[PDB]
DNA sequence: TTTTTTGGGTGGGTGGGTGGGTTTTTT
């Protein structure tokens, strides 16, 4: 809405110019997203915008990156065939891949490096340019590092990015060594412009300040915050999002209709995307987990269920205001294993899980708030903090303090710090991110 | 009451002239098969009958081209010594394929690329005659490229086959390129000629017509078919005939026997020829999978248990009204369940009565039209549910070795 | 510990096949 003086500058930076690697960055809030749309309606349609979770690349007005290039749900080994599939000779995706001009891409902190590789090879190899990066596209990235990192499952997943890239973050991959990223910063909040006090204290506790969080606990604990009317609970875990939506379910007249999940092989209940022994009643809100075969829906998408029936759901969409109709989905447990003939690590299918696509959301993750303006929110703290950024993005929200309420005080012996980000944050400074060697693996 | 005079006018055709190969083809029922039959007696038993599948060559009073050659049940890649290995010295093949002079071969439709292929370079090796194809035997094939396609595996030789000839088609071999292929067609069904109207449906089928399909809907429809004594099950699936065989078996009255094997050495759990355990029940229709030295039984005939303890096994079969005993040989006992089968297993066969159980649909080209093409009147076949002609299945390959065989020659160049 | 995405037929053909894979034979 309106683009500010930083905004508008930073417009001009990355048009009119032909350097063609930009990243876009600055505290949660700042106005990041709606510079997107500002360039979306400048190269509108020379330009495909891209985000790595659902609710991002709702925000975005655009699709996931997986969605897009037609990656898989694991581990996409460095320019491996196996993962990342050239499109067909004469697919949609390759005339969108030789036509493109733009890729503007959101939320690029929580791009994990394998993810934002597959996209440098998949772009260089169908477009006929082996020797530039991401093939000739101008390349828009916005996001911030002090937001969610990336999701490492350890293990052998973990072993293999860090041996190929040293880590797991967006800035760790290779093609920054062949092309300089231009950084453009903004800083002015726009979330919490009517509110400066609140939007200070969130600047200090970005800096890890301790005096900033003791404040935060003396103004934003209150426990029974997520009870006040139309306020969302966020979550460090699934499983304490479910516990939570447990109870704004069973206060609902409507009947109970339970959606029983099939797994097969070896499939543990840790991993499951939504409970097996899903209850709802009409009126609840929930969120989607994957897309539409035929696009009529989306991961991310919110929405209210509107009438329930043996295996045939449909949910009215906050999105567009259509009734959809949601078939259960199949989740595959996968498993990376060495290979001692072919000398490479192989991912394996143990397990399947079958569930409608579905889970309440008056409670979610951190993860899926990432990207949005909340009116209120409550952060349940759960059996705590594990990711770098949740805390940031949890309390980041919101316009005003008084729209923020917190289940517990925090102490600062849960704040969480990466090496890499330190070493990012203070190269771009200088303006630029421009890497002469990959990462060491350790 | 003898051969049809266009099965009289095909008989004369491949037998008195001097072209190397040939091929007579025509809708199901025609009498292809029963022609086949006059060509082994004029042959006076010297010629080499084979077929594709066992119930084919039970059929035709022949037996597998790979039990023949002994080809392994695999992709037998184009002239591949590990795959085609031609037979020893002094062997009891080596002596017949040398003094081999015809070799009829039907049910052609089902033979796969790599099968023919495989054919034509074990007779030209082991005959000593690399440049002559089939090793200069007379090739009489019989068959309908409408009927079931071969079978391609879901393992990718499929793209070994397109990489190699471009389809699995019988038609599609390099020898073509070689030799021209003599079609003679028949077209008057003898399988159905009892019931011109149904015969006349089964033609209009044959070439797609849908005004055909919704009469067909209309008239052959009737789930509660299966149910009669009798009567065959078909199914597309082989999972869904194994389950059909076994309410039939748990329904009936009358407590088992369970058969269950030996093992020895490195044996997958589908490397044995019938599964694992098997129970039974006196009366009870079910099939055999082998035939036996002596000349009893033979690997397709079915029919009822008479008296059944361990390890004798009285049953009564059909293709006689005669008597068996079947004990195992490496090691289980080789009958198994025959209420409901795959079409695959049907192809081939006239049938008195047939129900297309259709479960989740067919899959294959030429799966719908075997099905209802096994008996000789209407009333003798029911669909469990009613055919969409978005089931009907058509291979390209097929349509346009159809329309150049109109002159009668097939060849590749 | 959080994200991304779909594979079988006891999920079922009024959900549809340009959402996409699989069935069948041969010792
Ligand atoms: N220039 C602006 N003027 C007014 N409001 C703005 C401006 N830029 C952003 N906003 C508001 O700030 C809120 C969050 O901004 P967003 O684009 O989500 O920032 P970021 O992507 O940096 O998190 C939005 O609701 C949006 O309306
Ligand atoms: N000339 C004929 N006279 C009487 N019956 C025949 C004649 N030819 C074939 N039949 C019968 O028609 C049925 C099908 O014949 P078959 O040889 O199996 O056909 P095909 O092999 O072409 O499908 C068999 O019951 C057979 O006995
Ligand atoms: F930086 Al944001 F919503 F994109 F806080
Ligand atoms: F062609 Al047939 F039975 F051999 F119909
Ligand atoms: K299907
Ligand atoms: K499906
Ligand atoms: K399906
Ligand atoms: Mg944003
Ligand atoms: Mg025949």
Redo the contacts with the bound molecule.
Sequence with gaps: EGLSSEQQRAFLAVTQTPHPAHLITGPAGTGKTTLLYALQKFYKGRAVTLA????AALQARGQ?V??FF?????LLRYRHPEDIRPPGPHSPLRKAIEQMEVLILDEVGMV?VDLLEAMDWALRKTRKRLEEPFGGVKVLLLGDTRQLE??????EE?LYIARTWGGPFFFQAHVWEEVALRVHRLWESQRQREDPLFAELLKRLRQGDPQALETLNRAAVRPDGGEEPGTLILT????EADALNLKRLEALPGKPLEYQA?V?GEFAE?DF?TEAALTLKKGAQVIL???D??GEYF??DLGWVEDLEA??LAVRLKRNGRRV?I??????KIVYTYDSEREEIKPQ?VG?F?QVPVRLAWAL?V??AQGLTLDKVHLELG?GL??HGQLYVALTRVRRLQDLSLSRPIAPTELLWRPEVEVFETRIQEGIWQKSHGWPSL
């Design positions: 790595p979770t659902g609710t996931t997986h969605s037609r990656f898989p749900a694991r994990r990336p999701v490492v499952p350890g293990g973990a460090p875990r699934r499983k099939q097969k840790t995307p987990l994957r897309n075969p035929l991961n991310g295996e045939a109709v078939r259960p989905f199949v989740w595959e299918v399947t079958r993750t993860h899926k059996r594990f990711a």
